[PDB]
């Protein structure tokens, strides 16, 4: 068995990771108390899940986990949470002030001073891994915490864990629910510093997250705790071949192996389907659900794949959800929608089928359903959303506008057009491939 | 209160909308790189679709379909015909048609030396009875060609035995609804078809060479006019010999795209105005020539059309506080 | 756990920093000897950031009161809420400031700033981690004025890595005390462009203006302006002492709301405009709490938005009422009106909410803009200070403290800097 | 339409469904960058220090 540690950076990485880890508890069976009555080998482990879990001798199920925040107030409620037992004080490191929402302050003033004390925590989880895969990096991009300080430590990452795969799962910015005016600006510098050190990284878009939670859920203003419910399904849905005893996807060079043909465009559109409001009274078919991927309003990331080219597909269903049923939904959505693949790559589905139904937190939104399907596809379609942010970087950075914030904090201006220029090269590279 | 920008200086058509959307007092105009924005009169090229639709509190709206000019293109509007299922190789209402290169040369010649009356086109402008004139001018250009069966024998307007075609406005709304203007409008040509100028009608072409005008004025002859003509001449009626073929050809093309340029489930709402061309041979068979995707419009009929635009397309999102148009179901 | 250090000085700063004290402190459930006798502890989760705990269950403001002259402070501890401030931190001389800025940054305040900076070092070494300085005064007077921004020049030497923030209140003619207002206050802005990095422009022309036209006051006298300073001063640091909201601090402020560091000079408004001992029976509705506060009439610094644009925008709503409507409010405020907010800055307008809303309203709305129209007040003050300085009239009343003529030419070619800039931003 | 690679267990299993085939910074660089922007901090706190000693 091979372990895999996943960070989790900043505010939105932190409460997004308090979502996950409780998803897996229940998806596992895993009491508060860290007591897994199911496992019958107490202190020690083999098994699947022992990926994301280390055994105590008392029979404590521990997550392989390290929470990083610049400011205490995040991380205090998991201290205190209803979690509070399941980690132990090491994984949670805070600091006294935050980044200000400035890249700058959490890359380079900030970061500088506990960078080093972050890593030996993380060496430490690495120490008890007999065969270490790689991290699994939360974040968001807005945050000046994690924008800027997960930049560095991705840096450090790739020096200290050479062999070691990286997966992202970043939180691109939304006016609806957004938090500060220069998040295009910390979006673009991070992407530019951490592009060369990532293998593969999954995007959510607050304002897909917002808009299903309205339509779907029936909530009128969705909160935080209803958003990170919903991308923990998803999360749930990506790494539960990494969990549960499987063929597909087993360990995080799959990934890129199976999604990530060309390194420098490593960003699965993720899709999700059904999304069904817990207070209601019909169950969706293997067709309909698969079907549903294909809808824009069902994307981690609004764009229209109509427009794109495919690269790289993958469906990862759970329920009851048999082989025949997926190859009679898939002939039948290859034909009535256009769904052109790029002239080097085959026409081609990667399908993992995991026959318990998706757990869903007791008393949450969602309601349980027999079968639902996760899609992830590398679509050049995804460059319409490094468009829309790019352009708001060129509407303020042609005044030089917060410009002084970064420079202040020791950030040379030069860096603003260092990156700009990484994304039109990136925009570029999209185009050629999308034709 | 609603907003619209504006990046189409040149289009005739939405200068006026423009112009009657700011009369009714319920519309405001905004520089043209403003998101806050209900309506947006894109640019013809690369127009940025995927920046609309992410405006909270913004309904959003556009004069242009993305994805509808692979049938607004030479090359691609073949190329939709010949690989859809929908359309060929059942289609024929659109002449037999090659994309060559300065495929498909080898599957042309193939046609020609079969047939060996053999009188071709090829545009992007050249008409040939031998198949070798065409690929010589062709190679000389760097653009892509289409080569295309001319109409040997074209429905002639008596007196002046001259040749013409027939552009037809169509409006689909966000909906999906096809609407069809009820007032067409024939461009004939001044000089006298002959068998061996005259061959291409344009107007524009027609100034060049002004043989005749004010036969009709600017060589615009509308439907009411012909419509008597069919009757007196041939017995028939404009509706029964040719309109029906022009439905019917409209109806398929744009239900042939619908599921790939839907707005149906999207982000962002489209409409589009399209300009269809027509020719109509001796027997009363209507010929589908090509889809504009930017038309401009007869100076007798701009107030009437833009102004159902406004009422159809736009304050059907944006309502403010009997038709000209033919609803074509589906 | 973000402390902040208050000052207050010279009268006009004592004032409204008084008023301050004891609005908030009522908010949080403090009573004037200093203990909590509220109802719901989200008056203390963020209660340190104003007030230290001391022994007993006392909270005792995190505020340092200062002036030239004692008779000011006499009437703060002889107030109600006189009791509850830290007796060693009055710092006072009884020579007086005479409306003087020379005087206040040059001579008698200079002799008495090393006293107060000695206080401000004692809470500072107390706070687990000091987020900056909030500053009360006028640019009218001589202490508030002149040795306001000497503390502020001299806190920014020993603390240069904190926020500093300021409650500046801009004279009038319509409220004057003395003719040399505008000398005074042209000197104290240039000292607030380089030292500052957040001011709010409190300017006594709106104040006045708002207790005549709006409130009908005949006569409004300084406690009816103070009412208006009051209720602002509790808006605009609502988000920074209650709980759930996303923990705004004072950094924060100044970055989003910041553009380039010069223009940092923001316009406060309040909804609904209410005068002391004037309460009304019907609270607003969402829509009239979003109109009003974006009204010219709801603004405290005497310029007309409509004559500029905004830059950003920070808005609080204070009580229970539907978000979503709210959002919606706010929204059709830009779109509607989305020619008065540069385009160069995509989503520059932030809206936060609070449950609980200040006394004696079930809800209301303070607006924060930092808008080129406030050039407006500095054009208004270089105008009346080149009126006097073209005569070179009253200004031995500063020679004779020491200054030269330069020093006032080169204040005035900094505030003209200063405007001609703000002018740069209203092109886009 | 065709189908490889199935694999079975008692969780669930997954295959492959083919339908057309296809037509370095070091340590101490990042030393050289995080103190490299620590120097330009101080250099200019010291011209502001600097300034207000004038
Ligand atoms: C949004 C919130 O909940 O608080 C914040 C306030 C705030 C808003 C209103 C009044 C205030 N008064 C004192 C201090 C902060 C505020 O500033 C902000 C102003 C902003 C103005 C424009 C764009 C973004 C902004 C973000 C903040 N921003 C970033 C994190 C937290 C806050
Ligand atoms: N989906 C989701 N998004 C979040 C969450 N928390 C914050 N965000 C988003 O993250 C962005 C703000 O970044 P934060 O993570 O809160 O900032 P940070 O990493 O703590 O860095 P600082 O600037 O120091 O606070 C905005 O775009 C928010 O919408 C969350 O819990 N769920
Ligand atoms: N296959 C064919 N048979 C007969 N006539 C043809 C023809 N192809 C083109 N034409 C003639 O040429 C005209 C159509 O030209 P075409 O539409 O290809 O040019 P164009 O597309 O640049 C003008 P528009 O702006 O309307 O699109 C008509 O006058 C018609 O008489
Ligand atoms: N709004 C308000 N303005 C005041 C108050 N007291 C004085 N002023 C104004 O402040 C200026 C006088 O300065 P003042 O504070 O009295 O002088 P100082 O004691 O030297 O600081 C004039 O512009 C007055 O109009 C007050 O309580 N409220
Ligand atoms: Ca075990
Ligand atoms: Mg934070
Ligand atoms: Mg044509
Ligand atoms: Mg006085």
Redesign the pocket.
């Known amino acids: 068995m091979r372990e895999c540690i996943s960070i989790h950076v900043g505010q939105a990485g932190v409460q997004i990771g308090n979502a996950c880890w409780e998803l897996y508890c229940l998806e596992h069976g895993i009491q508060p108390d860290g007591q897994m009555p199911s496992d019958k080998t107490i202190g020690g482990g083999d098994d699947s899940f022992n990926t994301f879990f280390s055994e105590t001798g008392a029979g404590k199920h521990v997550p392989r986990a390290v929470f990083v925040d610049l400011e205490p107030t995040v991380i205090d409620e998991v201290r205190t949470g209803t979690y509070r037992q399941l980690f132990h004080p090491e994984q949670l490191i805070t600091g006294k002030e935050d980044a200000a929402?400035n890249y700058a302050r959490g890359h380079y003033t900030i970061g500088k001073e506990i960078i080093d004390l972050v890593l030996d925590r993380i060496r430490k989880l690495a120490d008890q891994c007999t065969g270490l895969q790689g991290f699994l990096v939360f974040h968001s991009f807005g945050g000046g915490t994690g924008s800027g300080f997960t930049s560095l430590l991705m840096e450090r990452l790739s020096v200290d864990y050479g062999k070691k795969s990286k997966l992202e799962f970043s939180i691109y910015p939304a006016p609806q629910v957004s938090?500060?005016?220069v998040e295009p600006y910390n979006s673009i510098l991070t992407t530019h510093t951490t592009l060369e050190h990532s293998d593969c990284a999954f995007m959510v878009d607050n304002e897909a997250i917002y808009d299903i939670c309205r339509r779907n859920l029936d909530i009128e203003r969705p909160t935080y705790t209803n958003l990170n419910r919903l991308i923990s399904q998803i999360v749930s849905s990506i790494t539960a071949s990494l969990r549960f005893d499987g063929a597909l996807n087993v360990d995080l060079t799959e990934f890129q192996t199976n999604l990530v043909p060309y390194p420098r465009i490593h960003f699965p559109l993720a899709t999700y389907a059904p999304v069904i409001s817990a207070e209601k009274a019909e169950q969706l078919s293997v067709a309909e659900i698969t079907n549903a991927c294909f809808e824009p309003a069902n994307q981690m990331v609004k764009c229209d794949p109509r427009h794109g080219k495919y690269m790289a597909c993958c469906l990862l269903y759970r329920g009851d959800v048999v082989p025949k049923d997926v190859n009679a939904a898939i002939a039948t959505i290859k034909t009535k929608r256009s769904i052109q693949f790029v002239d080097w790559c085959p026409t081609g589905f990667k399908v993992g089928i995991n026959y318990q139904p998706p757990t869903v937190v007791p008393g949450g939104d969602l309601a349980k359903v027999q079968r639902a399907v996760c899609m992830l596809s590398n679509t050049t379609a995804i460059a319409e959303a490094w468009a829309r942010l790019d352009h708001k970087f060129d509407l303020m950075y042609a005044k030089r506008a917060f410009v002084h914030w970064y420079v202040g904090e020791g950030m040379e201006e030069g860096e603003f057009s260092e990156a700009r220029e990484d994304m039109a090269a990136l925009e570029k590279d999209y185009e050629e491939v999308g034709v | 209160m609603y907003t619209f920008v504006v990046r189409d200086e040149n289009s005739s058509v939405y200068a006026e909308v423009s112009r009657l959307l700011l009369a009714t007092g319920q519309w405001k105009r905004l520089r043209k790189d403003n998101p806050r924005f209900n309506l947006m009169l894109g640019e013809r090229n690369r127009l940025p679709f995927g920046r609309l639709g992410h405006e909270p509190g913004l309904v959003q709206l556009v004069n242009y379909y993305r994805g509808a000019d692979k049938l607004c293109r030479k090359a691609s509007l073949v190329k939709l015909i010949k690989t859809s299922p929908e359309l060929s190789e059942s289609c024929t209402w659109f002449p037999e048609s090659y994309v060559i290169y300065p495929d498909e040369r080898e599957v042309f010649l193939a046609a020609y030396n079969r047939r060996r009356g053999n009188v071709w086109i090829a545009k992007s402008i050249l008409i040939s009875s031998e198949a070798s004139e065409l690929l010589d001018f062709i190679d000389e250009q760097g653009q892509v060609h289409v080569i295309q069966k001319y109409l040997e024998k074209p429905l002639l307007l008596e007196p002046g035995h001259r040749k013409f075609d027939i552009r037809s406005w169509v409006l689909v709304d966000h909906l999906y609804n096809i609407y069809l203007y009820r007032e067409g409008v024939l461009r004939t040509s001044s000089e006298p078809y002959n068998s061996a100028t005259c061959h291409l009608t344009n107007h524009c072409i027609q100034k060049e060479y002004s043989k005749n005008y004010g036969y009709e004025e600017g060589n615009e002859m509308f439907f009411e006019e012909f419509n008597q003509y069919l009757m007196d001449a041939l017995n028939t009626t404009l509706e029964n010999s040719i309109l029906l073929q022009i439905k019917h050809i409209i109806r398929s093309c744009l239900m042939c795209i619908e599921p790939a340029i839907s707005t149906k489930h999207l982000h962002y709402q489209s409409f589009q105005l399209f300009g269809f061309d027509f020719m109509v041979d001796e027997e009363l068979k209507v010929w589908l020539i090509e889809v504009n995707g930017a038309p401009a419009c007869a100076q007798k009929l701009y107030a009437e059309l833009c102004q159902g635009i406004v009422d159809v397309a736009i304050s059907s999102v944006f309502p403010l506080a009997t038709s000209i148009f033919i609803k074509l179901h589906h | 756990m973000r402390e902040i250090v208050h000052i207050q000085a010279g009268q006009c700063g004592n004032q409204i920093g008084a008023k301050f004290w004891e609005v908030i402190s009522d908010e949080h459930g403090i009573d004037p000897t200093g203990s909590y006798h509220g109802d719901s502890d989200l008056q203390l989760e963020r209660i340190n950031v104003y007030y230290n705990e001391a022994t007993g269950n006392k909270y005792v403001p995190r505020a340092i009161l200062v002036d030239l002259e004692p008779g000011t402070m006499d009437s703060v501890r002889s107030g109600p809420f006189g009791q509850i401030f830290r007796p060693d931190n009055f710092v006072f001389g009884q020579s007086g400031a005479g409306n003087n800025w020379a005087k206040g940054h040059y001579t008698e305040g200079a002799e008495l700033v090393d006293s107060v900076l000695d206080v401000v070092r004692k809470e500072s070494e107390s706070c687990d981690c000091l987020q900056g300085f909030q500053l009360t005064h006028s640019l009218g007077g001589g202490t508030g004025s002149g040795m306001g921004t000497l503390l502020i020049s001299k806190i920014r030497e020993e603390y240069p890595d904190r926020i500093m923030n300021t409650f500046s209140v801009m004279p009038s003619p319509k409220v004057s005390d003395t003719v040399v207002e505008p000398y005074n206050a042209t000197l104290s802005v240039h000292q607030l462009v380089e030292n500052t990095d957040e001011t709010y422009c409190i300017d006594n022309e709106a104040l006045y203006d708002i207790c005549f036209r709006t409130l009908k006051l005949t006569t409004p006298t300084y406690g009816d302006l103070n009412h208006l300073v009051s209720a602002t001063m509790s808006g605009?640091?609502?988000?920074?002492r209650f709980p759930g909201?996303?923990?705004?601090?004072?950094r924060?402020?100044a970055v989003?709301?910041v553009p380039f560091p010069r223009l940092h000079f923001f316009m406060p408004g309040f909804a609904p405009l209410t005068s002391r001992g004037s309460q009304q029976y019907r609270a607003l509705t969402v829509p009239e709490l979003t109109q009003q506060m974006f009204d010219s009439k709801n603004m405290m610094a005497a310029c007309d938005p409509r004559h500029g644009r905004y830059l950003?925008?920070?808005?609080?709503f204070r009580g229970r009422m539907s978000m979503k409507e709210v959002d919606e409010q706010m929204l059709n405020v830009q779109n509607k009106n989305s020619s008065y907010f540069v385009e160069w800055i995509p989503?520059?307008?932030?809206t936060?909410v609070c449950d609980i809303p200040p006394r004696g309203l079930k809800m209301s709305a303070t607006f924060?803009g930092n808008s080129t129209a406030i050039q407006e007040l500095f054009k208004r003050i270089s105008e009346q200070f080149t009126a006097m300085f073209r005569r070179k009239a009253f200004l031995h009343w500063y020679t004779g403290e020491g200054m030269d003529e330069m020093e006032f030419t080169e204040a005035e070619s900094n505030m003209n800097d200063l405007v001609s800039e703000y002018q740069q931003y209203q092109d886009a | 339409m065709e189908v490889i690679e199935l694999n079975k267990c008692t969780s669930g299993q997954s295959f492959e469904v083919i339908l057309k085939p296809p037509s370095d910074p070091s340590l101490e660089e990042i030393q050289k960058k995080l103190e490299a922007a620590e120097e330009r901090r101080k250099y200019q706190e010291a011209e502001l220090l600097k300034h207000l000693a004038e």
């Open positions: 929402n938090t500060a005016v | 605009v640091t609502t988000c920074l909201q996303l923990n705004a601090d004072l924060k402020l989003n709301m950003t925008v920070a808005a609080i989503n520059n307008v932030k936060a924060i």
